[PDB]
Amino acid sequence: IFKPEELRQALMPTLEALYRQDPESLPFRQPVDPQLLGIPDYFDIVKNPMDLSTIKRKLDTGQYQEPWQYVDDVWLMFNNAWLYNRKTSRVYKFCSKLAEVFEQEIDPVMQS
Numbered sequence: 100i101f102k103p104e105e106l107r108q109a110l111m112p113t114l115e116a117l118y119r120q121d122p123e124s125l126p127f128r129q130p131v132d133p134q135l136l137g138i139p140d141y142f143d144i145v146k147n148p149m150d151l152s153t154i155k156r157k158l159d160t161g162q163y164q165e166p167w168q169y170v171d172d173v174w175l176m177f178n179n180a181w182l183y184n185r186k187t188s189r190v191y192k193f194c195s196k197l198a199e200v201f202e203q204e205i206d207p208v209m210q211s
C-alpha cells in the first residue's frame with residue numbers, strides 16, 4: 100500500500116533527472132505532434148503515446164497507486180521512441196541516454 104503523495108515525493112527526483120538532461124530530454128518533454136514534427140505516420144505506429152509532461156501530470160494528480168505503474172509509463176515512453184525512430188536518429192540516441200539516466204536514478208529510489 101502506497102500513499103500517492105508519499106510515492107510522488109519518492110519518484111519525483113527520478114522524473115527531475117530525466118528533465119535535467121539537456122538536450123536529451125527535449126524530444127520527450129511534450130507529447131509528440133506528428134504534423135509539427137514531420138512524422139505523419141506516428142499515430143499509426145505508436146498506439147500508446149507517452150511523454151514526460153503526461154507522466155508528470157499523472158504523478159501530480161496521484162494516478163500512480165504503485166511505483167511500478169510509474170516505471171511502466173517511463174519505459175513506455177522509451178519503448179515508443181525506440182520503436183518509431185531509426186537507430187540513427189537523434190531521438191533514438193537521446194532516448195538511450197535517458198534510459199541509462201533513469202536506470203541509474205530509479206535503482207536507489209526503489210531500494211528506499
Ligand SMILES: CCOc1ccc(C(C)=O)cc1NC(=O)c1cccc(C(=O)O)c1
Nearest residue numbers: 122125126127131136138179180183184190
Ligand atoms: C523532428 C523529429 O522530432 C521528434 C521525432 C520523434 C520523437 C519521439 C519522442 O519519438 C520526438 C521528436 N521531437 C523532437 O525531436 C524535438 C521536439 C521539440 C524540440 C526538440 C529539441 O531538441 O529542441 C526536439
